[PDB]
Design a protein around this nucleic acid. Structure first.
Ligand code: CL
Ligand code: CL
Ligand code: MG
Ligand code: MG
Ligand code: MG
Ligand code: MG
Ligand code: MG
Ligand code: NA
Ligand code: NA
Ligand code: NA
Ligand code: NA
Ligand code: NA
Length: 228
RNA sequence: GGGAUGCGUAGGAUAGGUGGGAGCCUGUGAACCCCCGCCUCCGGGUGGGGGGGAGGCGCCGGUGAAAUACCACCCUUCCC
């Protein structure tokens, strides 16, 4: 078989040709998470954009009302008085701009990296090759750069997520854990969808949310009506 | 509609993109072996069949721009 028996059993619980309401899907996804850990709940959208047109990029952040249900280890890079701000805001690690390389050596255990704009030259210059292709390079457009570094850090530790369309024109985000109560998943799903809509490019043609699905780390998908 | 296809270099070697991922598969038949189709960058890959009857796979590390399981939405090319 393509898939093992656990997966095949889950597949029987979803009607592949049905478009579910968000409320139904939020209940259903809880039964689609039988792998041996608390699985992540995901939302995917095929977007009505031309992904090869810079002016139709979809990229941003959204604070999920119920968070991600996971720890996010944040590294901050800062200079001057901003180091203390980063540290007092709860970053797991805060390095001065001048010690970047030592981060590279092996002190590199984090889920997210933030910086202030005035260290970004050092950051890019010395960290870009590594961080960039791992989705960890701070960028203003991704909400991971700014002088409000304390606020950024707090938002990330409170379950803000990033989203950015891939170059096929699809987009994806984690939005909670399968062990969440269903109405909390429902809230998080809608929050993400609202954020996507808030980021529909002005020049995008046709239906924006062409398809939207909810799914779990190791389970099948459920197609949803994003407007419910 | 049906079926395939995804390989610069380095790296086990055939790594399309992104997101999830620390677990996954297995008497609902593991390892290994044999037959056959298709695809092929000629390395292999992929799908089916027969034997077999209990072990494979991933996380880490290494290499690399990127990492292998598994799962999700997509995209490329080809065949009929
Ligand atoms: Cl934003
Ligand atoms: Cl300062
Ligand atoms: Mg589970
Ligand atoms: Mg892949
Ligand atoms: Mg692949
Ligand atoms: Mg992937
Ligand atoms: Mg591989
Ligand atoms: Na199973
Ligand atoms: Na199951
Ligand atoms: Na599952
Ligand atoms: Na995802
Ligand atoms: Na998935």
């Amino acid at each position: 078989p393509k898939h093992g028996k656990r997966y095949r059993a889950l597949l029987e619980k979803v009607d592949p040709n049905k478009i579910y309401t968000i409320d139904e899907a939020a209940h259903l996804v809880k039964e689609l998470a039988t792998a041996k850990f608390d699985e992540t709940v995901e939302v995917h959208a095929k977007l009505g954009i031309d992904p090869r047109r810079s002016d139709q990029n979809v990229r941003g952040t959204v604070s999920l009302p119920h968070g991600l249900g996971k720890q996010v280890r944040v590294l901050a890079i800062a200079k001057g008085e901003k180091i203390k701000e980063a540290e007092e805001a709860g970053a797991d690690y805060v390095g001065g701009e001048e010690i970047i390389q030592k981060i590279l050596d092996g002190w590199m255990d984090f889920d997210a990296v933030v910086a202030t704009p005035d260290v970004m030259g050092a950051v890019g210059s010395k960290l870009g090759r590594i961080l960039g292709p791992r989705g960890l390079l701070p960028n203003p457009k991704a909400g991971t750069v700014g002088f409000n570094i304390g606020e950024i850090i707090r938002e990330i530790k409170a379950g803000r997520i990033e989203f950015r369309n891939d170059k096929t024109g699809a987009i994806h985000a984690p939005v909670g854990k399968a062990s969440f109560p269903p109405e909390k998943l429902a809230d998080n799903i809608r929050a993400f969808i609202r954020a996507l809509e808030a980021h529909k490019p002005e020049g995008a043609k046709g239906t924006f949310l062409r398809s939207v699905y909810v799914t779990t780390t190791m389970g099948p998908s459920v197609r949803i009506n994003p407007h419910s």
